[PDB]
């Protein structure tokens, strides 16, 4: 007996750690240790899944004396509406309400558009350029943080100066850093919401100022605001480098999506299937029980912190059959996870769809001789930022 202790080793630059997948054998749930409080970590498709839509299992802390969190973690949970287990189903229900509609089918034609025509201006200042290039810094990141700048209704210069503080926010390993950054967020929202208050345009911030009819007070909007910068391009970026990378591991499949862009769509679901980096320790969704819940033969307690690895689950051969081959030509594969399912589904997922799929149309298209510069391990997966990811892709072509 050796309970197994989060964050598991991963010997690869992307995957799951080896001990996640041997639990993943064994069973759906396992008691595991963490660097804070011991957790249910749930690594099967089917019950991932059905847990992420069980309402007893919720972001909020029910516990009278909460275990501590970073000040990242706890900036994340808050800007959800988490932080109070007694508020949570009002206060999140209406951030649900009052986020959905901004992604409008109207929005997403028109931002689809601009979006491709980004992306050949992007891919055609690389082409120009001369290798060694950053692709981390002049695509990954880059049309992210436009598509941010479009929904707020800011120039496109403003994205330099808030293009590291989810980033920084969410740096589990200095909360004085998070803290600062998180201040310079609020500044510059409030900033934004004074200003949208008299010069509105087609924008998220004119929609909230404008809603039922004015009732919202600056600091909601602006709370709202903040949620979308900083899940609005961070997580994007880093699947765009980890698609990237995927492709390049799986030459025939990339060859296929050259040929054939129509394979974008198809694609794009693998890379978010399969596109896990470092330890992983993103794609775990946290979770506490609001009641008792039984999984299999084992219960789940009121107040127990559960662990829904929805990047193992993505793997799973139970729903993925050969779950860790990249394959566009699956039919009718499974519902990936990596968005998450049930009460927090992500909100951004179909723009972030329209993103990933522009980007992949054309890529290896438009630079087909595309390849890394460097060896692949020394790609540093940054494990102490929530949301990972590597802060440079150098690459030829
Ligand atoms: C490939 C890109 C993205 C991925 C993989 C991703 C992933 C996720 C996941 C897994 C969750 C659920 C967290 C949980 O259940 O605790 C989530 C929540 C959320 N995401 Fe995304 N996201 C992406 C892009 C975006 C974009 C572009 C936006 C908006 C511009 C966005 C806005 C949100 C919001 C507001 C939430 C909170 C939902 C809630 O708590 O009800 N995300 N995201």
Same mark, same amino acid.
């Given at each position: 007996?050796?309970? /197994?202790?989060?964050?598991?080793?991963?010997?690869?630059?992307?995957?799951?750690?080896?001990?996640?997948?041997?639990?993943?054998?064994?069973? /759906?749930?396992?008691?595991?240790? &963490?660097?804070?409080?011991?957790?249910?970590? $749930?690594?099967?498709?089917?019950?991932?899944?059905?847990? !992420?839509?069980?309402? +007893?299992?919720?972001?909020?802390? /029910?516990?009278?004396?909460?275990?501590?969190?970073?000040?990242?973690?706890?900036?994340?949970?808050?800007?959800?509406?988490?932080?109070?287990?007694?508020?949570?189903?009002?206060?999140?229900?209406?951030?649900?309400? !009052?986020?959905?509609?901004?992604?409008? &089918?109207?929005?997403?034609?028109?931002?689809?558009?601009?979006?491709?025509?980004?992306?050949?201006?992007?891919? *055609? #200042?690389?082409?120009?350029?001369?290798?060694?290039? *950053?692709?981390?810094?002049? !695509?990954?990141?880059?049309?992210?943080?436009?598509?941010?700048?479009?929904?707020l209704?800011?120039?496109?210069?403003?994205?330099?100066?808030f293009? #590291?503080?989810?980033?920084?926010?969410?740096? #589990?390993?200095?909360?004085?850093?998070?803290?600062?950054?998180?201040?310079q967020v609020v500044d510059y929202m409030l900033e934004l919401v004074?200003?949208?208050?008299? @010069?509105?345009?087609?924008?998220?911030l004119? @929609?909230?100022?404008?809603?039922?009819?004015?009732?919202?007070?600056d600091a909601?909007i602006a709370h709202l605001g903040n949620?979308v910068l900083?899940? =609005?391009?961070?997580?994007?970026?880093?699947?765009?480098?980890?698609?990237?990378?995927? !492709?390049?591991?799986?030459? $025939? #499949?990339?060859?296929?999506?050259?040929?054939?862009? =129509?394979?974008?769509?198809?694609?794009?679901?693998?890379?978010?299937?399969?596109? $896990?980096?470092?330890?992983?320790?993103?794609?775990?969704?946290?979770?506490?029980?609001? =009641?008792?819940?039984?999984?299999?033969?084992? $219960? %789940? +307690?009121? =107040?127990?912190?559960?662990?829904?690895?929805?990047?193992?689950?993505?793997?799973?051969?139970?729903?993925? /059959?050969?779950?860790?081959?990249?394959?566009?030509?699956?039919?009718?594969?499974?519902?990936?996870?990596?968005?998450?399912?049930?009460?927090?589904?992500?909100?951004?997922?179909?723009?972030?769809? %329209?993103?990933?799929?522009?980007?992949?149309?054309?890529?290896?298209?438009?630079?087909?001789?595309?390849?890394?510069?460097?060896?692949?391990?020394?790609?540093?997966?940054?494990?102490?930022?929530?949301?990972?990811?590597?802060?440079? %892709?150098?690459?030829?072509?």
């Amino acid at each position: 007996t050796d309970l /197994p202790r989060l964050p598991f080793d991963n010997p690869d630059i992307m995957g799951i750690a080896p001990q996640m997948l041997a639990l993943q054998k064994e069973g /759906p749930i396992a008691r595991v240790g &963490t660097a804070g409080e011991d957790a249910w970590l $749930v690594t099967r498709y089917d019950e991932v899944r059905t847990l !992420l839509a069980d309402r +007893r299992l919720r972001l909020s802390n /029910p516990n009278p004396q909460p275990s501590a969190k970073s000040a990242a973690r706890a900036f994340m949970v808050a800007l959800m509406a988490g932080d109070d287990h007694e508020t949570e189903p009002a206060r999140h229900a209406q951030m649900r309400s !009052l986020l959905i509609p901004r992604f409008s &089918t109207r929005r997403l034609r028109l931002m689809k558009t601009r979006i491709e025509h980004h992306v050949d201006e992007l891919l *055609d #200042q690389l082409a120009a350029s001369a290798p060694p290039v *950053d692709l981390h810094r002049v !695509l990954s990141f880059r049309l992210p943080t436009m598509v941010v700048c479009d929904l707020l209704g800011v120039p496109l210069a403003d994205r330099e100066r808030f293009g #590291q503080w989810a980033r920084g926010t969410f740096d #589990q390993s200095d909360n004085e850093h998070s803290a600062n950054t998180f201040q310079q967020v609020v500044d510059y929202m409030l900033e934004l919401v004074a200003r949208k208050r008299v @010069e509105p345009g087609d924008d998220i911030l004119s @929609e909230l100022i404008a809603e039922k009819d004015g009732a919202l007070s600056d600091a909601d909007i602006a709370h709202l605001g903040n949620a979308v910068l900083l899940f =609005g391009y961070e997580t994007t970026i880093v699947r765009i480098d980890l698609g990237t990378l995927l !492709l390049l591991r799986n030459p $025939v #499949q990339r060859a296929q999506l050259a040929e054939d862009p =129509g394979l974008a769509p198809a694609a794009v679901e693998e890379i978010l299937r399969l596109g $896990v980096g470092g330890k992983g320790s993103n794609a775990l969704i946290p979770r506490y029980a609001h =009641g008792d819940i039984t999984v299999g033969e084992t $219960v %789940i +307690r009121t =107040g127990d912190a559960v662990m829904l690895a929805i990047g193992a689950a993505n793997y799973d051969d139970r729903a993925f /059959p050969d779950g860790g081959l990249f394959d566009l030509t699956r039919v009718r594969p499974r519902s990936h996870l990596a968005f998450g399912h049930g009460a927090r589904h992500c909100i951004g997922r179909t723009l972030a769809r %329209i993103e990933l799929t522009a980007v992949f149309e054309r890529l290896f298209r438009r630079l087909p001789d595309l390849r890394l510069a460097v060896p692949e391990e020394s790609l540093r997966w940054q494990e102490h930022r929530i949301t990972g990811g590597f802060d440079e %892709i150098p690459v030829t072509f």
